[PDB]
Structures are given as structure tokens and as C-alpha cells.
UniProtKB/Swiss-Prot annotation:
Main location: periplasm
The keyword Magnesium belongs to this UniProt entry's keyword annotation: no
Keywords: Copper, Electron transport, Metal-binding, Periplasm, Signal, Transport
Gene symbol of the encoding locus: bcp
Keyword 4Fe-4S: no
Protein name in UniProt: Pseudoazurin
Part of the whole protein covered: 29 to 152 of 152
Amino acid sequence: ADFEVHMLNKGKDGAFVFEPASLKVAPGDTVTFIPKDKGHNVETIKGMIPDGAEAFKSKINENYKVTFTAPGVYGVKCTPHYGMGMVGVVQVGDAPANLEAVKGAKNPKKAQERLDAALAALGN
Ligand SMILES: [Cu+2]
């Protein structure tokens, strides 16, 4: 299955957001991250990807397709707006085994706020 997540200058949750900020996909599914507004990218957050997963970082303004294979939770950020909380979570599969490692990772306050809310949306 193929999903899309947009990087936006604003949305419902304020400025500098991923929409949706939380998404659950099956292993093997793809997500295309779309900087619909200029000035955004997508990058894995250090400490917030499961075992077997690769870190990734898109170029600013590129639509970036990732095929998620390793089960677990993934925290992602927009590199330039990470300090203003421009983050999202992708959960791949059920019962993510890295949940306690993710929940422990260090983030800017505004990022941590939105990550916690995203994790919670997923029912974690
Ligand atoms: Cu951005």
C-alpha cells in the first residue's frame, strides 16, 4: 500500500507540521513525504528507528518515497524546522518492539511534544 505525508508551513496542529503526524503502515508499504510548501525535508531522528532500519534524509523540496520494511516506530523530522517541532511518527506493523527506546530518545521540547502526541495517537 502507498501512503502520503505532507510537510506544511501550517496546519491544524500549528506551524511547521507533518500531516498526518502519525501513520500506521504494514511492513513493505511505502510512504511518500511531500514538501507541499517550500523549505522542508524528511530525516530520521537519531535514536528513533528500529533495528534493521536505515537512516534517511531527503533533499529540501524533494518528494521522497520510503519503503518501510523493518517493524517498529520511526520518528522523523524536517531538518530545518526540528527545533520548532516539525516531526512525525510512522509505525510499521503492530506491537512495535522499539517503543521504549523511541520514547527515551532526546528531542527539542517542541519536537518531543508533537512526538509524544503522535505516539499517543497511535495508541501507544
Ligand atoms: Cu521544514
